[PDB]
Design a protein around this ligand. Structure first.
Ligand SMILES: *[C@@H]1O[C@H](CO)[C@@H](O[C@@H]2O[C@H](CO)[C@@H](O)[C@H](O)[C@H]2NC(C)=O)[C@H](O)[C@H]1NC(C)=O
Ligand SMILES: *[C@@H]1O[C@H](CO)[C@@H](O[C@@H]2O[C@H](CO)[C@@H](O)[C@H](O)[C@H]2NC(C)=O)[C@H](O)[C@H]1NC(C)=O
Ligand SMILES: *[C@H]1O[C@H](CO)[C@@H](O)[C@H](O)[C@H]1NC(C)=O
Ligand SMILES: *[C@H]1O[C@H](CO)[C@@H](O)[C@H](O)[C@H]1NC(C)=O
Ligand SMILES: [Ca+2]
Ligand SMILES: [Ca+2]
Lengths: 483, 483
C-alpha cells in the first residue's frame, strides 16, 4: 500500500520568509516543526517565476514552454488552459487507486464549459478559486475581520472571484476571512473518507496564502508581529498544522508523505505586504535565485530522515518522485523531471545535476535564460520585473531591460548564492570547464525543446467569465451570491 | 555557586551566515545544535560596526564614545588603548572569585610596556594576538595547509603578528593553520584547573574566525562547501563543538552558561570570502541592520528554555547580565546596559526598549546616527562604507557620502527589517508618535553623553610594535620566531 501524499503549494512565498529559513519576524511554528522533523531543501527550484507556468510544471512534470503555458499568466476571460492531453500527477495517482483532491487556487485555465477545471484534469473532489484571488474587484471585499478592506482594489472590470465546488459556484465572492476554513474542512473529509474506503488520498492544497491581497481570519488578524503579510502567513502555517493534526488523529502519520513549497518568488512591488527572498537576489518574474529558488520541506516519519539537503531538486521532479512512491506507472510523455525518492528515503543521491530556467515571456530565438549545473549558474539573458520592483537592487526593477550576455555571467552559487560576483568578469580551468558545459547544455536544450502553441495567445472572451447567475444583466457586476 | 560563563566573540560574522540563521551553503553543525538547545536572538545588536569600539563596549558595557574608543580601529603602532580606569566584565568576575581567561583577538590597545594587554584589564591567563590578524604582512604566511598562502598580503610595513602568551611573545608569526588548536588547548586547561580548584571559570573566546585573511587547519581545508570563508567558519564551529565537549566531559553542562555572537557585520569588500548579512542591509562599517545586528545564541541547560526571542538586546547588556548571574557587584560607572537574566531564565521580559547607534567615525555635533525604539528605527544620518563595498545596493558603498535626514528615514523593522520602505517618505498617528519619541531619544542622549578623549588620536609610535627580538635590526622585518 502506497503513502498518503499531501502536496501543499503556497502562493508567492519567498526563500527567506519561513522562520526555519531565517526571517526575523515571520511566525511559522507548524512549518518550522515540520522542517525540524523532516528534510529541508536549500536548493529547490521552479522552472518559471510565475503562477500559471510554475503550477503547470508542478502537475504535468514538464517544462511550461512545451504545453504552451506562456507568455505570462492566464486571466479570467482567457480561452486557453492546461491541455487535457497533458497528464497530471492527479491522473497518474487516480489510476493507482488514489482518492485525489484539490483545495484552492487552480490558475491553469477555465475555458468554455469549464473544460480546464480540476475535475477534468484528474481530481475527484475540488473546492477553490479557478485563478488568483486578486483577479476580480476587491474594493468591497473584506480581507481581515471585522471589516478591514482589501488594499488596492485588485483587478477591475471583472466578474467577482467565484468559489467553485467542482464545476458549480458555491459562492461569489466567497468570504475571505473564512475561505481557509472551508479548505481545511474539505481536506479533513477527503482524508476521512479515503480512510474508511481503505483508499490512499492525494491532497493538493494550493493555498491563496501569501498572494495579494493578504487576508486572514479573526484568529490571526494582528497576531503575527509581521503585519498583513505575516498574518496571512500565520494562517497558512496554521492550515499546515490543522492538516498535520487531522492526519495525526487518523493515525496516518508514518503513512503520510507531506511536501511544502511555493510556486514562485516574492512579489516585492507589494512592499511591506510582500514576501522576502532573503539573501537571494530579486523575486517574482525574474530568473534570479530570489524568483526561482523556493523553500521546501519533506515530511514522512520513518522514511524521511530529519536533516538539510543541498542536493539539486525541482518541482518538475515531484510527479516522478510521487509516482515512484505510489508505484504508479509513469506516462509516455517525455518528463523533464527525475525520481527524488532515493534522496528522500536516504538510499542515494539526487539525479538532478542541471537546471534550466525560462523567463515570464519566452521565445524560441533566445531560449533558456539561465542554466545551472552543480554549483555554477550562467546568465545568458538578464531581465528585470515589475513584480520585483521597489527593491534596493536595480537589477530587479522593470527599468532593467532584457540584456544579452556573451560570455554569460557565471556565478558560483556555493560561495555566492546572492549572485553578486561574476567569475567571467575579467580564467580558472574549473570555471572555464564549467562555462563550456553550461553553454553546451543551453544549446542542446534550445535545439531539442520545441515551444508548444501559446495558450495565452488564444485570446480573451468575456463570455467565459464564471457567473453565479447565468444569462445575467448587467454583467459582470450582476454575478453575485455571497455567504 | 555562580555559573561557568563562556563568552565566544566571533570576528566579522554576518546575520545570515550561520546555518540556523538561513544560509544555503554554510556548514555550522555545532552552532546549530547550540541554537536548537538554547535561546536564539533575532534582534541582538552592537553599538558600533567595527572591531575596536564593539569589543570595547562588550567588555566595559559602556558606549564606545565615552571611553574615547574612536575614531575607527586601533593599529599596531597606536599609543592608545582601552583605559585601565574602565572596569571590564573580567574585572567584575575576578573579584567574585572567577578564574578569568581570554583566548584570541584583543584589539583594545597595546601601548608602551603592554599596559593595555589583557593581564592588566582583568584576565588571569591569556593566549592570542593583540589585534586583528591581518594587521601584519601575510605574503609568506600560510592560511590553509599544506602551503596555500593568505590572499591579499595583508597590512605591509608592519611587524609580523605575534602570539602573546600573557605579556611575552610565544611565536611571531604564529602558524595560522594551527593557531586555533592552541586556543582550544588553553581553554580546556583553564576549565580543568578551575574545576580542580573549586572555582568558576570565565572563558572569553575572541576568535579570529571569519575575519580576513580566512584560514583553517587541514581538517577543514575544502571541507565546508562554501569555500575559504566556509572553511574558516567550519573551524569556528568545530571550536565551539570541542568547547562543548570539554565542558561535557567535565560534567559542567547544566553549570555552564554559553553565549555566542560576532563583533560586527560582514566585510563585503572581501566578496566571496566575506560574510553575509542575509535579508539585512549593508554590512561592516554602516549603521544599517546588516552591520549592527549580529547573531546570538544563549545556552545553559535547565535555565535557558529552547526557543527564539525577538526581544531587544545588545552586547552592552552582557556585562550586567553576566554580573547578575555571578552575583557580582556592579561597578559605580554608568552602564549603558541592562540585566537580561529575566529573559534568559524565562522569568520576565527584556528591559531593552531603545537602542542607539554611532558611526565608525563619530563626532559631538552630529551625535547618534540611528536610534531604535520597539519596532521603529530612525536614520538621522546615513553613510556608506568601504567595508560594505562590492554589493548590489549602492547605499552601502563608500561612494554614498554622509547625508543628513530631516525628518529622519523611519523604518518599521517588524515588517521591513530590510530597511527598504521609509514611512515618513510621503502620517499614521502611531508612526507620528514614534517619530517624536525617536527624535527626543536622540536629543536626550546627545545632550547627556559626552565624548571621551579620542584614544586613536593619541598618535602612532612605531617603537611600540611588539618585537620578538628586543633591540633588533633591521626592524620591523627582523622580528621573528616561527613554530
Ligand atoms: C465533487 O463531486 C463528487 C461527485 O462527482 C462528490 O463526491 C461525493 O461526495 C459525497 C459527500 O459530499 C460522498 O458521500 C460520495 O461518496 C462522493 N462520491 C464520490 C464518487 O467520491 C464531492 O463531494 C464533490 N466535492 C465538492 C467539493 O463539490
Ligand atoms: C599566564 O600567567 C599565569 C601566571 O601569572 C599562568 O598561571 C599559572 O599557570 C600554571 C600552568 O601553566 C599553573 O600551574 C599555575 O597555578 C597558574 N597560576 C595562577 C596564579 O593561575 C598562566 O598559565 C599563564 N598563561 C599563559 C597562556 O601564558
Ligand atoms: C462597491 O463599490 C464598487 C466600486 O467602488 C462596486 O464595484 C461594487 O459593486 C460595490 N458593491 C457594494 C456592495 O457596494
Ligand atoms: C617573503 O616575502 C616578503 C615580500 O614579498 C618579505 O616581506 C618577507 O620577509 C619574505 N619572507 C620570506 C621568509 O621569504
Ligand atoms: Ca505565484
Ligand atoms: Ca570585527
Amino acid at each position: 500500500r502506497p503513502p498518503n501524499i499531501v502536496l501543499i503549494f503556497a502562493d508567492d512565498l519567498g526563500y527567506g520568509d519561513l522562520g526555519c529559513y531565517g526571517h526575523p519576524s515571520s511566525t511559522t511554528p507548524n512549518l518550522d516543526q515540520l522542517a525540524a522533523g523532516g528534510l529541508r531543501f536549500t536548493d529547490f527550484y521552479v522552472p518559471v517565476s510565475l503562477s500559471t507556468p510554475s503550477r503547470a510544471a508542478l502537475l504535468t512534470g514538464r517544462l511550461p514552454v512545451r504545453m504552451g503555458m506562456y507568455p505570462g499568466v492566464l486571466v479570467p476571460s482567457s480561452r486557453g488552459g492546461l491541455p487535457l492531453e497533458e497528464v497530471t500527477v492527479a491522473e497518474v495517482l487516480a489510476a493507482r487507486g488514489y482518492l485525489t483532491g484539490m483545495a484552492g487556487k487552480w490558475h491553469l485555465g477555465v475555458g468554455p464549459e469549464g473544460a480546464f477545471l480540476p475535475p477534468h484534469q484528474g481530481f475527484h473532489r475540488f473546492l477553490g478559486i479557478p485563478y488568483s484571488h486578486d483577479q476580480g474587484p476587491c474594493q468591497n471585499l473584506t480581507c481581515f475581520p471585522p471589516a478591514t478592506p482589501c488594499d488596492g482594489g485588485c483587478d477591475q472590470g471583472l466578474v467577482p472571484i467565484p468559489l467553485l465546488a467542482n464545476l458549480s459556484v458555491e459562492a461569489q465572492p466567497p468570504w475571505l476571512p473564512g475561505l481557509e476554513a472551508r479548505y481545511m474542512a474539505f481536506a479533513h473529509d477527503l482524508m476521512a473518507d479515503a480512510q474508511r474506503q481503505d483508499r490512499p488520498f492525494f491532497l493538493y492544497y494550493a493555498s491563496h496564502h501569501t498572494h495579494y491581497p493578504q487576508f486572514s481570519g479573526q484568529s490571526f488578524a494582528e497576531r503575527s508581529g509581521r503585519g498583513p503579510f505575516g498574518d496571512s502567513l500565520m494562517e497558512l502555517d496554521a492550515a499546515v498544522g490543522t492538516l498535520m493534526t487531522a492526519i495525526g488523529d487518523l493515525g496516518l502519520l508514518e503513512e503520510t508523505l507531506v511536501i511544502f513549497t511555493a510556486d514562485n518568488g516574492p512579489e516585492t512591488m507589494r512592499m511591506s505586504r510582500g514576501g522576502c527572498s532573503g539573501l537571494l537576489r530579486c523575486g517574482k518574474g525574474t530568473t534570479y535565485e530570489g524568483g526561482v529558488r523556493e523553500p521546501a520541506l519533506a515530511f514522512w516519519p520513518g522514511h524521511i530522515a530529519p536533516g538539510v539537503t543541498h542536493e539539486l531538486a525541482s518541482s518538475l521532479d515531484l510527479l516522478p518522485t510521487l509516482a515512484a512512491l505510489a508505484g504508479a506507472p509513469l506516462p509516455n510523455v517525455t518528463l523533464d523531471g527525475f525520481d527524488l525518492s532515493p534522496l528522500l528515503l536516504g538510499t542515494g543521491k539526487s539525479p538532478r545535476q542541471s537546471l534550466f530556467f525560462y523567463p515570464s515571456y519566452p521565445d524560441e530565438v533566445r531560449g533558456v535564460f539561465a542554466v545551472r549545473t552543480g554549483k555554477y549558474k550562467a546568465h545568458f539573458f538578464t531581465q528585470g520585473s515589475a513584480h520585483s520592483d521597489t527593491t534596493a537592487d536595480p537589477a530587479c526593477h522593470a527599468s532593467s531591460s532584457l540584456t544579452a550576455h556573451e560570455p554569460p555571467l557565471l556565478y558560483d552559487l556555493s560561495k555566492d548564492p546572492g549572485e553578486n560576483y561574476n567569475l567571467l568578469g575579467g580564467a580558472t580551468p574549473e570555471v572555464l570547464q564549467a562555462l563550456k558545459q553550461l553553454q553546451l547544455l543551453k544549446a542542446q536544450l534550445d535545439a531539442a525543446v520545441t515551444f508548444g502553441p501559446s495558450q495565452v495567445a488564444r485570446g480573451e472572451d468575456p463570455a467565459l467569465q464564471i457567473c453565479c447567475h447565468p444569462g445575467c444583466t448587467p454583467r459582470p457586476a450582476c454575478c453575485h451570491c455571497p455567504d
